[PDB]
Design a protein around this motif. Structure first.
Motif, PDB file in Angstrom:
ATOM      1  N   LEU A   1      15.644  22.509  40.589  1.00 29.62           N
ATOM      2  CA  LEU A   1      15.311  21.987  39.265  1.00 29.62           C
ATOM      3  C   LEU A   1      15.756  20.547  39.057  1.00 29.62           C
ATOM      4  CD1 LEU A   1      16.177  25.134  37.134  1.00 29.62           C
ATOM      5  CD2 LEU A   1      13.903  24.159  37.537  1.00 29.62           C
TER       6      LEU A   1
ATOM      7  N   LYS B   1      13.421  18.213  40.846  1.00 26.54           N
ATOM      8  CA  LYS B   1      12.124  18.287  40.185  1.00 26.54           C
ATOM      9  C   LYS B   1      12.038  17.484  38.889  1.00 26.54           C
ATOM     10  CE  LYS B   1      10.244  22.226  40.146  1.00 26.54           C
ATOM     11  NZ  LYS B   1       9.649  21.486  41.303  1.00 26.54           N
ATOM     12  N   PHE B   2      13.050  17.626  38.043  1.00 28.66           N
ATOM     13  CA  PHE B   2      13.073  16.945  36.755  1.00 28.66           C
ATOM     14  C   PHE B   2      13.775  15.598  36.709  1.00 28.66           C
ATOM     15  CE2 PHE B   2      12.190  21.357  35.468  1.00 28.66           C
ATOM     16  CZ  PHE B   2      11.143  21.141  34.583  1.00 28.66           C
ATOM     17  N   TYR B   3      14.779  15.396  37.547  1.00 23.02           N
ATOM     18  CA  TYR B   3      15.511  14.136  37.491  1.00 23.02           C
ATOM     19  C   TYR B   3      15.279  13.159  38.643  1.00 23.02           C
ATOM     20  CZ  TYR B   3      17.390  16.613  33.525  1.00 23.02           C
ATOM     21  OH  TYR B   3      17.451  17.280  32.316  1.00 23.02           O
ATOM     22  N   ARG B   4      14.780  11.979  38.270  1.00 21.98           N
ATOM     23  CA  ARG B   4      14.440  10.913  39.206  1.00 21.98           C
ATOM     24  C   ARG B   4      15.620  10.076  39.680  1.00 21.98           C
ATOM     25  NH1 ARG B   4      11.916   5.017  38.078  1.00 21.98           N
ATOM     26  NH2 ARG B   4      10.309   5.902  36.701  1.00 21.98           N
TER      27      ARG B   4
END
Lengths: 219, 219
Positions: free
Chosen positions: A212, A215-218
């Motif tokens: 997760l 997936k969500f944090y760049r």
């Protein structure tokens, strides 16, 4: 977003190995759940974690806040705090706050000053108060409170922004599960995961949170 | 939250098959992206979606807000609104708001009044104002704005709480990707997903969201 995994002392080496291989950044030692709390036993656990390349959070949860009596907790905090990256001390343990701040500061380590509420998400002034006090005592304030609705989650995350700074926010329970992932954009620096398939209400398995996070944090 | 999938006309029937088997609740017809805007070509699609047991969002985005020029636009709106569960009209298209409300209102359908900013997340008063305006026009206010930091995501979500009610919140881009999942606890009733691969920053595959919804929002 640093991912922490709470561990008691059972199967430590294997659990620690799984924690490291699955992507955990931190191992929180829940000494209040240890079968042995002697100074050198806990110290050894700290070193093992470090030898695997992870960071540690020294926690000795008082009975009031969901832990259990540890006769030598004061000794453990004062003597092992300088050997742990973070030491989690309850805001309610007022007598130790100043002492532990001085000790960790001199050692170049960090203090996490926490507040737990297993019944509800307290009113807004309490949320702000806990954050303020945590900051004034020189630590990273931590609020872990039971959400009784999705609104409690939104409220905790948003009200916490009124007391700007680094912090740790957790809405416990099934309703607050999303807080363990989204808390990061609101300033929550550490999230907690169950080692294996997590199965207390609201928890997210380490392997799932790692996926997760990418997936969500760049980067 | 209801999961919606934006679809152009290209391979419509096959993509509607995937969206349905995969768990979507709604199909957003991006008519501004269709090659044939003729009333019956569109009225047929709207009907295909319904026969498969899914809901519809009629969207004819204007060039200002990312869409295209569509001659028979009004025609499409006035004539197809009463047939679509939802109709998405831009707040900026002032002329159509009133009559579009009346149409969908008489037909027992819903209106989504949107605002887009592909540049940045506007100041707080604008976030609040777009929400208020959407409400006073009798629709579900929708805000989709580009996040240029994680802070922009938190601000969008938290400020939107100040105008209580059902809404649609979207922080576009890789920074705002978490908003597509977390928006729900802040009142966002609908989230949008790419049928398959994320062809643009921030998008989340339908299959991934259906699973994420189950994991985070059982309650």
């Amino acid at each position: 977003m640093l991912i922490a995994v709470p561990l008691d002392d059972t199967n430590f080496s294997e659990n620690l190995k799984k924690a490291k291989e699955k992507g955990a950044d931190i191992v929180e030692l829940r000494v209040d759940q240890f079968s042995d709390t002697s100074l050198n036993y806990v110290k050894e656990k700290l070193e093992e974690v470090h030898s695997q390349g992870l960071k540690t959070i020294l926690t000795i949860r008082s009975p009031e806040e969901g832990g259990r009596e540890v006769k030598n907790r004061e000794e453990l905090f004062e003597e092992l705090s300088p050997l742990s990256d973070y030491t989690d001390i309850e805001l309610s343990s007022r007598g130790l706050l100043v002492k532990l701040y001085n000790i960790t500061k001199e050692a170049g380590k960090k203090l996490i000053i926490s507040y737990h509420n297993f019944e509800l998400t307290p009113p807004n002034w309490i949320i702000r108060e806990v954050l303020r006090e945590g900051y004034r005592y020189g630590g990273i304030p931590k609020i872990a409170v039971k959400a009784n609705s999705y609104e409690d989650v939104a409220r905790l995350l948003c009200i916490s922004r009124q007391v700007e700074g680094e912090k740790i926010l957790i809405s416990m329970g099934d309703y607050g599960k999303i807080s363990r992932l989204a808390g990061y954009v609101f300033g929550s620096v550490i999230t907690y995961c169950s080692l294996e398939k997590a199965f207390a209400p609201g928890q997210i398995p380490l392997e799932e949170m790692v996926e997760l996070r990418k997936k969500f944090y760049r980067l």
